[PDB]
Design a protein around this ligand. Structure first.
Ligand SMILES: Cc1cc(-c2cc(CS(C)(=O)=O)cnc2Oc2ccc(F)cc2F)n2cc[nH]c(=O)c12
Length: 127
């Protein structure tokens, strides 16, 4: 029932980096997913109390959401782009585990996941 604390977006002891790939993930990949018509449920941690989903955090043990990912990109929380990509893949996998196929939320996540994959199919490089 209770909402756990949301995932950290800053850690003074974690080594940070900004790469061109990470800057792209923020400016292009995240901000394009953000504006999609299906993005709104994924823009903040799932509020199990508001939604009356006391089982949500009983089943989902590594929560993740694009709002968290956004703040992590903006705080250069990540070391490389694959760390970020893994937060996206965790967010989608969470949705498919907790829900069932055909659910409206699942249809939303599948659409987002395909757009996301289009956008990271080609990332930039550094010289
Ligand atoms: C990942 C995620 C996000 C949400 C969700 C989040 C918010 C925003 S907040 C501040 O209240 O948490 C509102 N409604 C939601 O549920 C929906 C339920 C039907 C639907 F068609 C569209 C939804 F967005 N849910 C709900 C159930 N399962 C999930 O995996 C899930």
């Amino acid at each position: 029932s209770m909402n756990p604390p949301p995932p950290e977006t800053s850690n003074p002891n974690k080594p940070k980096r900004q790469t061109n790939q990470l800057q792209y993930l923020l400016r292009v990949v995240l901000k394009t997913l953000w504006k999609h018509q299906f993005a709104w449920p994924f823009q903040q941690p799932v509020d199990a109390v508001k939604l009356n989903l006391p089982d949500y955090y009983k089943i989902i043990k590594t929560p993740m959401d694009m709002g968290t990912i956004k703040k992590r990109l903006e705080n250069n929380y990540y070391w490389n782009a694959q760390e970020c990509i893994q937060d996206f893949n965790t967010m989608f996998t969470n949705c498919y585990i907790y829900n069932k196929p055909g659910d409206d939320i699942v249809l939303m996540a599948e659409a987002l996941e395909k757009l996301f994959l289009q956008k990271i199919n080609e990332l930039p490089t550094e010289e």
